């Protein structure tokens, strides 16, 4: 089980998504480009480690790219296991995916929110404080940890 993330013009991505149906395929955008979110099997490719909830097709979508040192991986997975049991009770949270890059220790958490206000409330949570701290302390030898926010066309 995988997530494919492809960025480009709306026209390009709309042509691309017309080869496919199903896989919770979702077109998103920011102020200058579009982004295609695609669940499939076999741009950028990520293995899905965990999925909660389901996409409602409105609001905002947040991509948190997190580089982890070897020793941080088991610890991070256990934090995420414990925190994920409460995602159903997180206000305005539709869906979350924990995913990993094929070629590196780069993890990507994708969260689908009813509104940016709910996402920003969640940023006060212990899970978000830890994620942010991990992003903050990243060894940039590996690339940058970053958070990207998208809306719906």
């Amino acid at each position: 089980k995988k997530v494919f993330i492809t960025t480009g013009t709306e026209h390009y991505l709309r042509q691309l998504m017309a080869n496919y149906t199903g896989g919770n395929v979702t077109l998103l955008q920011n102020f200058s480009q579009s982004l295609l979110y695609q669940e499939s099997t076999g741009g950028a490719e990520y293995r899905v480690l965990q999925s909660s909830g389901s996409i409602k097709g409105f609001g905002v979508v947040v991509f948190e790219y997190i580089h982890l040192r070897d020793e941080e991986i088991p610890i991070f997975l256990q934090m995420y296991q414990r925190a994920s049991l409460h995602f159903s009770e997180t206000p305005g949270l539709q869906s979350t995916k924990l995913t990993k890059a094929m070629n590196m220790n780069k993890f990507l958490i994708i969260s689908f929110w009813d509104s940016e206000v709910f996402f920003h409330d969640w940023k006060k949570s212990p899970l978000s404080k830890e994620i942010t701290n991990i992003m903050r302390k990243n060894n940039t030898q590996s690339g940058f940890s970053h958070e990207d926010i998208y809306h719906y066309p």
Side-chain angles (χ1 to χ4, degrees), residues 5 16 27 33 38 40 43 45 68 75 84 86 90 135 149 152:
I5 303 299
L16 175 44
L27 182 72
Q33 70 184 20
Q38 175 172 13
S40 184
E45 176 187 356
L68 294 180
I75 295 154
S84 73
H86 299 307
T90 302
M135 290 186 150
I149 298 172
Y152 289 77

Side-chain angles (χ1 to χ4, degrees), residues 69-117:
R69 302 158 181 104
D70 274 347
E71 70 266 18
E72 281 158 4
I73 295 161
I75 295 154
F76 181 96
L77 295 174
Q78 299 307 128
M79 152 211 92
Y80 197 94
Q81 176 70 90
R82 297 172 182 273
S84 73
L85 297 179
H86 299 307
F87 287 164
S88 71
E89 291 311 303
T90 302
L93 176 60
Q94 296 169 20
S95 189
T96 64
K97 265 69 189 181
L98 169 64
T99 72
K100 191 201 157 290
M102 303 298 291
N103 49 348
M104 46 186 28
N105 295 338
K106 180 178 70 188
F107 290 74
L108 162 66
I109 297 173
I110 310 165
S111 51
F112 292 79
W113 300 91
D114 286 3
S115 86
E116 197 167 348
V117 179

Side-chain angles (χ1 to χ4, degrees), residues 10-23:
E10 183 186 326
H11 194 255
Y12 172 81
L13 291 184
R14 278 194 190 279
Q15 315 316 117
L16 175 44
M17 69 198 297
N19 294 317
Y20 300 99
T21 163

Side-chain angles (χ1 to χ4, degrees), residues 48 62 64 83 89 118 120 136 139:
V48 174
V62 179
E64 290 169 317
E89 291 311 303
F118 291 114
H120 289 121
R136 186 179 63 86
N139 181 4

